[PDB]
Design a protein around this ligand. Structure first.
Ligand SMILES: O=P(O)(O)OC[C@H]1O[C@](O)(COP(=O)(O)O)[C@@H](O)[C@@H]1O
Ligand SMILES: O=P(O)(O)OC[C@H]1O[C@](O)(COP(=O)(O)O)[C@@H](O)[C@@H]1O
Ligand SMILES: O=P(O)(O)OC[C@H]1O[C@](O)(COP(=O)(O)O)[C@@H](O)[C@@H]1O
Lengths: 513, 490, 468, 507
């Protein structure tokens, strides 16, 4: 009568649906990471403490706005609030810090507003004499290569898709367009080129400086904007360089080229953000659910983290409760298989930052139980390469074992995170407690569905066996304290055959002491 | 390269997901019916003509507010806009008319009105509640827990705080308010008088509530379909009996989400859709699907998600409420549901869906079901432009829709009501033949099949030379559908 | 409770196995064609009538031995016996005649041994193995007819004898040829060429008998009309423990292509001397039908055995029991997944008809057909229900026994003036056939497949009708 | 690619068939146990040594015939043959001894259509003529109704009951034949009330205990109570001797479930079953029984006429090679030889053949859907031993391990791995001689008997035995240094503490 275990037993997906039960309560542990954008609503130490207690695992800093000193104080506040729980490692929740880059943009110049008439002509010019003299006849852009990347018939969107232009003739340093969808044109408006291969650099002058700030500020991950190809990922990696080699690169897929070149992008990245906001400007909004499900599926298939983002609980900016469409959207992202779900304006500037978080947490947990693990696991098992790698064999064996005995947890010792990530890719129902002494591994582990990172602070015991056991019991204490299991329950424990990374090979079924 | 047919051939659901392709265009035909609430924004004859052109199939009138005269004029305006396309039967689109009842409510002015004492109109509340039981006021704004129950008094402690005549909900309680209120009685009579196609019955909690709506409609209303609106915990609990007694179901998410934790609504939705899909009865997903478009010309990303996932869940019909009744952009809201539903329909994993549906398809001796399922399999085999079905009552085409073909079901009928009510079923495009009955029956049959051919051609569903499936029967009258033919479009 | 219908509902194959029930009786109809080799035991007119009554659908004639006069009289007697039933076309059973060729061969003191294959040095290398006298002797091994395991033997597609034997077959109006020792597609094209234009409608069934035939199976299947799993010679060429792999591989690939596959040799071998078979033999027959063989075969069991008739009756009993035990639920799911979205109306009609038949558990699928093609298309999707194929073409009726499920029936009535009534006549003929044979009764639902006009290629109409 | 791993990857069963490849060679290990009936052709110590080297795992003694003295000597010879290899424990193969009971029987020119009286009057106990026939089953009338069939001399003659008395029955002959003396009588569809064990059986069973047999094949089991009675005869002294119930008639098939639950395993006794039931239905009974045994996780034996022609011929028929293959594909834990090894001209060849076929068929199993299904039809219990076992089998698939190595005192931990039907061989390491012999009943279990003394450091004692397993697999040719294998151990000594799985290289 709990955790949708009746529906879990259904031999078909239809009967699985039919069995979903509002009176079947979930478990305590919530497996989907919650990423919260920080802003004036949620930036104080006191409000960040409650953000943490409400379920925030990752603090997102949006670098489209705010100075470096502004962002350094946000990061300070986040760390002050996070370490205010440090005294008891058993309860301490790690919180990661994500730097989301502004990235390359196309801006128009100065106009004050002009009215564009649907069906009228408008000329785009790269001639800087019209740079501060834009009007309903002539509009200047700052993308000096635009003529090389568009064709007669190509569409140009101005001000987050509000205005739609179609190129009717191309010149030298100008294009002549017809206004499809008119409206009020303004100054300094964002511009998108649906379907174009935009040749703006992978990282802007500003991103370059912001990225190097992220290294100095010891950020855990970068959300890299407007990634269109693998070479763009490689430039971000290169800018972060040697000292930033362990910072995770999440590519943001925000346009048609990124969706189409997705495979090469995913290969080069540590993870992916389905940036639905900008993506639904670049592509028809009715197609966005296809790109989301395709991307979640392919990341799931590759074992790489995927984040569903933007407007998930949007009304909660003004109202203390979501719309039904919004709660549907969060549940369905989890059902699709997103590792993480994201809050933007709902936490940064909204009237109800805490309710928004607490709601993603309630929905995430309800949806995690509603997942059809029976076919999910079968398909991932079917789709799993037969290879000699002992660490993979061990990971899959532990997930199989966890389903067999419906265990309270899969406990994993990990230095880098990788052994825990390997378990997460098989989508166990039980929560993965990733015991680590590496504080960065513990913060970054939040990117993966099911992983519950715990930061062990005990000294290394001189007998290695004792030291392993010490960390395994730390994990049992965390599970007991957090209410994931109780003394007598069975849990699965993963360890390796010598110290250091890459030797995970040992799966035990143990009672909770 | 089209209609997500690469994704359709995937051996696993996971691969099916991976193959979903924004560069793969859908077909013209949209299978999921669109139900539009009519109100001040959409009531004019001119606007309704555009609602129809945009894709509205059913006009919902909400009898929570409005005079009978107001509603009578709305219905009249819907019929004028509809019949203004009647001159060409090939392009004529039927539009049904749905009456959505106010239903039983609890209202404020806890005795049986200030910070101290509050008065409620529901007199049997003390018998239905217990100590610890929760009471919500003004659409779940305020929350109350009873600390002591008395004769005509409840003593509560307020949980969440923050007016006159406000709505009360009593979560997890068996409310004994009558099936059909005093105002409901008058309104169902008006529904009969005005020839409504369907009643959407509010706050159905059990089978006997549907039987009461059925009894009130009685012999004069015996062809009006009853769609039970599930809006509270009891109606989720007692869903199986309610479904058995009903002609279809509305997932009334608005109120449902006041009654149960907002985070559980997707479970109740997916359960009711799956179970209606299993039973072959129409299911409507309702409420706040494109809510932001009341004030904005474009929806949030979570809103287009919700509409797509509703279609993927298996809903026969989707709904708009304030979005089309009173918002600033009603035609846009309609057009947006048409676009998404169409994308999502291509995205369904028909391969497993059809597999699982027929694995429940009973081995009855019934020839009509055997013919229906053969036709759907044949439609998958040749990827047909359409399944064309001659039906008097709709039943023959309902039986095809039950197996969820990819191809559109052109249901040809001479019955105007049959044509309007077919919209409740995923994939049915009802066309109303007006040609006289031919002397020879065989010629009469062929005349309506050719009518359907011309409709599909005129709507861009198929062109000369394509292959379609045609379902007919061996003799006149309902219940004899037994003949499936694979024919080319002339 | 009948026809293993409880087991048929199992959602898994393990549970399907667990529900198989010896108290669940099969239907009357037996879908798997039985092919009988004729010799001294089974060549008299008297014995042949009983072979037919017992369930013989095809008369195999082994041209490894016998003169043209000998074989001429066997065929004469098979036709005499077959046509002794023609008086009532409702109960008359067509019987096909298959010519099985001798094929190319390698033939032969302890000091020096001579063989007749001139290119043997080129085709073999030091380390290669040579078997003599049906694998009884081995050379590089085993002391105590030459086979070249795993070698590309360049003997001709057909010998000189094969050419006049096929010529004789054309003269004698045989329905099919079982071509021996097929190694490549070009061998099949040679048999096709020799048969020529006058023998254009004679079906070529390739006998797969060696490691090269197996490795090159796909080009061979494409070029043939069907396949024989010739387990005898194939078990000499390859290790006998590997023969079931080859059998199942070929049956699977044949079902995948929708072409007839025959399982042959030693199926009921002990019944040459004994009146009933061993448990291994009963198991072999049942499993060949479960594998998906269109036809099963008897050689010495019927050619020279003491119990020819008991060997036929026993195959009939087992095949009928095994047909019920097939896990149709997944078989049909897989066939329908493994078949393409074509624009071909007849294919959509065929598959919809089989779908319908499962849905109402119909007593038959009745199909009018001139060439047999419309019925072949239906049999490809492996329906539980028997396929009553009505044809006016006697060659079509006789060749239709190659396909699982097809009960071919030859309509003798003249063509009716109006086409509508002509079709109804043949549909009623099918109804009368089914009732007389006990396949179904009045009130039962059947599926009926017709076209929209006369001539082949226009099958487009499926109807679900009660038996009148 | 080897052991049909291309076919192993097929998304469908049809495609799996289509990929089966004769040029894909098996692994060296062979998982299906082989039971050989020992008789005049296989009794010698020297012949038995070669039987063992050919692949005999279990020596079956049929007590239908032969004295206690004769059978005692057969056992002695099997043990002398078996222990001749005991010098090297790495190459030593355990061999089990199974006692097959005679069971409850019914014993006595007939023209078809003629009348025949079946009388129970002992006056005619030696005057069995064509007119009147005597039987030794006094209750036969109790369980005979008008219309019942009666078979005589292993189904050679058939009769139907037309009139009924108490001492007699008026039959008419269906299938005529030559009626001999003291021939076997079967009653199809009858609820025969003969005891679970005859007087002779009770003696032979107690002799079984005296002789320390590993298992009993109990003839003619028709109901749960029959199995309990066999269990009561073996008593506390024979409490560890495994009871394999022989399913030989309609009643046992119909009541299979209650019989399965009480037994330690099942024999599909095809010979006698095909006299009781129409021969064409036996394959249904076999598949039903193997499936349900697979589902219950209890060993099932396929038996009788599998390589029958090899009694006289050095090579089998195509139908016989097919039959052995299909039994393995069905999921039979063990395959059996009777006359082929007991009395035939080619006993060693019959064993080597079943060995060659078994191995091929084992590669040709569709593990993908087999393990999927086993795992779906599989309870969620708090049992850590079951969860470790399933995790090891999944791990073995994921990395295509060369073996699953399991330490087991009682055999239970290895039985639990074997029930998930891994492709990889289960090398079960035990110090318990009876555990090692009885483990042969289970598909995939290769028992090895460790005879090192118990090390004072238990961690070392555990590792000693894992390394012993490594040495066996290298010597046997199951794998080699650098190959990855799965190792199953427990957290403390004694049964029921298996909980540790490790993926490791062969050293
Ligand atoms: O779906 P229903 O109500 O059973 O109607 C289907 C009927 O339509 C027909 O195709 C034509 O019937 P009519 O000519 O009376 O309209 C019948 O053969 C068939 O029984
Ligand atoms: O299987 P075939 O050779 O295509 O024949 C099927 C034909 O049989 C028919 O049902 C009847 O045709 P005929 O009248 O020419 O015999 C046709 O409609 C159809 O095309
Ligand atoms: O299969 P069983 O009978 O449970 O035996 C498994 C046992 O074997 C062991 O690995 C070793 O046990 P011993 O040292 O007592 O032989 C235990 O850890 C484990 O419980």
């Amino acid at each position: 009568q709990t955790q949708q275990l009746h529906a879990a037993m259904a031999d078909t997906f239809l009967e699985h649906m039919c069995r979903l039960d509002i009176d079947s309560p979930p478990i305590t542990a919530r497996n989907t990471g919650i990423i919260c954008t920080i802003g004036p609503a949620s930036r104080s130490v006191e409000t960040l403490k409650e953000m943490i207690k409400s379920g925030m695992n990752v603090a997102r800093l949006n670098f489209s706005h705010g100075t470096h000193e502004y962002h350094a104080e946000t990061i300070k506040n986040v760390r002050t609030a996070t370490e205010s729980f440090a005294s008891d490692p058993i309860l301490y929740r790690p919180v990661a810090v994500a730097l989301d880059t502004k990235g390359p943009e196309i801006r128009t110049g100065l106009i004050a507003e002009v009215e564009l008439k649907k069906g009228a002509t408008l000329k785009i010019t790269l001639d800087n004499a019209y740079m501060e003299k834009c009007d309903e006849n002539i509009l200047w852009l700052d993308y000096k290569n635009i003529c090389k990347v568009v064709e007669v018939g190509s569409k140009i969107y101005v001000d987050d898709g509000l205005i739609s232009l179609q190129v009717k003739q191309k010149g030298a340093d100008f294009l002549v367009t017809e206004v499809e969808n008119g409206g009020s044109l303004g100054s300094k408006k964002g511009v998108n080129l649906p379907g174009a291969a935009v040749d703006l650099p992978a990282v802007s002058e500003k991103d370059i400086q912001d990225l190097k700030f992220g290294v100095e500020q010891d950020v855990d991950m970068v959300f890299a904007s407007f990634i269109r190809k693998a070479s763009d990922v490689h430039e971000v990696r290169k800018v972060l360089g040697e000292k930033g080699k362990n910072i995770k690169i999440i590519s943001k897929i925000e346009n048609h080229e990124g969706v189409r070149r997705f495979d090469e992008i995913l290969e080069a990245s540590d993870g992916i953000m389905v940036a639905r906001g900008d993506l639904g400007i670049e592509i028809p909004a009715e197609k966005v659910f296809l790109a989301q499900k395709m991307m979640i599926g392919r990341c799931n298939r590759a074992g790489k983290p995927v984040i569903c983002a933007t407007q998930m609980l949007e009304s909660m900016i003004k109202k203390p409760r979501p719309t039904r469409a919004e709660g549907s959207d969060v549940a369905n992202a989890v059902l699709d298989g997103a590792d993480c779900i994201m809050l933007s304006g709902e936490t940064a500037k909204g009237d109800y930052p805490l309710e928004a978080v607490r709601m993603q947490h309630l929905i995430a947990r309800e949806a995690e139980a509603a997942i059809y693990h029976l076919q999910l696991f079968e398909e991932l098992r079917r789709l799993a390469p037969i290879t000699s790698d002992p660490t993979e064999a061990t990971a899959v064996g532990a997930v199989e074992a966890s389903f067999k005995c419906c265990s309270g947890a899969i406990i994993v010792l990990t230095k880098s995170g990788r052994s825990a990530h390997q378990v997460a890719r098989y989508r166990p129902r039980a929560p993965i407690i990733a015991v680590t002494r590496n504080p960065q591994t513990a913060r970054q582990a939040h990117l993966y569905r099911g992983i519950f990172p715990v930061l062990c602070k005990d000294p290394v015991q001189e007998a290695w066996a004792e030291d392993v056991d010490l960390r395994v019991n730390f994990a049992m204490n965390v599970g007991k304290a957090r209410g994931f299991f109780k003394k007598g329950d069975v849990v699965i424990v993963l360890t390796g055959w010598r110290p250091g990374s890459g030797f995970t090979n040992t799966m035990r079924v143990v009672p909770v002491p």
